[PDB]
Amino acid sequence: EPEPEQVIKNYTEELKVPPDEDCIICMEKLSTASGYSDVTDSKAIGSLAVGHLTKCSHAFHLLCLLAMYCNGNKDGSLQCPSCKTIYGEKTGTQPQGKMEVLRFQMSLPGHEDCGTILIVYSIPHGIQGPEHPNPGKPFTARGFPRQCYLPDNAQGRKVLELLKVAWKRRLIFTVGTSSTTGETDTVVWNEIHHKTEMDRNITGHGYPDPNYLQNVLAELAAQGVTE
Ligand SMILES: Nc1ncnc2c1ncn2[C@@H]1O[C@H](COP(=O)(O)OP(=O)(O)OC[C@H]2O[C@@H](O)[C@H](O)[C@@H]2O)[C@@H](O)[C@H]1O
Ligand SMILES: [Zn+2]
Ligand SMILES: [Zn+2]
């Protein structure tokens, strides 16, 4: 993985003279100096260095870009803050654990045509790593194992494989704060809704749900997991 300054040099093409149009990262004119210049320090990147992104052609202070990148885990990918194009292979802060998958013949509410896939995520507590909020300090993992259900049809089996890619790229979980329990520095769901109940009366996260499959299949396209 290249260095943070080099990551921004890739997937970027410097602008000769920046327009009057604003940089949406620092809310300052691209013509002027980055608004994060006072707290961000590069080697090869100035404060009036500006390029637009390779494919999506959105322009920012390359220092802002760098300021952004650096606030996250530094996997060598970069996400356009305007249109969210992924540059490289986005990955994420998911702690070590296991993903088991099972199938059973019983159908789910709304999918009586087919069988059911059981996904079991088991993730132990540990010590936060460099990518996590407070490196070195412990993190908790609440509620594991967490059982998840997919209709065993064509889409459901597709989403299954896409979720195996998500796991590989440490995308399904993250260390952070729980919206449910308010507890901090802990393993929580990250951006990819999972059905944890067959019967949606129990918790609110179950079946039937017509559009779940369509929702998640785009919820992980938003993290760069596609065909
Ligand atoms: N029970 C749930 N099942 C699936 N997704 C859930 C659940 N509760 C919340 N979510 C989704 O998880 C995301 C973040 O919610 P958090 O509460 O921060 O995540 P987490 O604390 O892991 O979720 C609560 C989890 O803890 C367990 O005690 C509980 O049974 C559930 O699986 C949001 O997308 C939210 O909609
Ligand atoms: Zn800026
Ligand atoms: Zn863009």
CA distances from 72 to 23, 24, 75, 134, 171 (A): 19, 18, 9, 13, 14
d(CA 168, CA 149): 19
Domain ranges in the chain are 4-87, 98-222
104 to 100, 107, 117, 149, 205: CA distances (angstroms): 14, 8, 7, 10, 20
58 pocket-lining for ligand 1 (C-beta < 6 Å): no
Method: X-ray
Distance of CA 86 to CAs 58, 89, 203, 222, Å? Answer: 13, 7, 33, 9
Token pair recorded at residue 223: 């993290």
Helices (H), 78-174: 154-168
Residue 178 Cβ inside 6 Å of ligand 1? The answer reads yes
Atom of ligand 1 nearest to the CA of 146: 32
Q: Nearest ligand, CA of residue 197?
A: 1
Query: What is the assigned CATH class of domain 4-87?
Result: alpha beta
> What whole-number distance in Å separates Cα of residue 143 and Cα of residue 121?
10
Give the residue whose CA is nearest to atom 2 of ligand 1: 205
Resolution in A: 2.6
CA of 177, closest atom in ligand 1? 18
Q: Which of 180, 185, 198, 209 to mutate to test the pocket of ligand 1 (most atoms within 8 A of CB)?
A: 180
- SS3 for 148? strand
Evaluate: CB of 6 within 6 angstroms of ligand 1.
Answer: no
* Class of domain 98-222 (CATH, top level): alpha beta
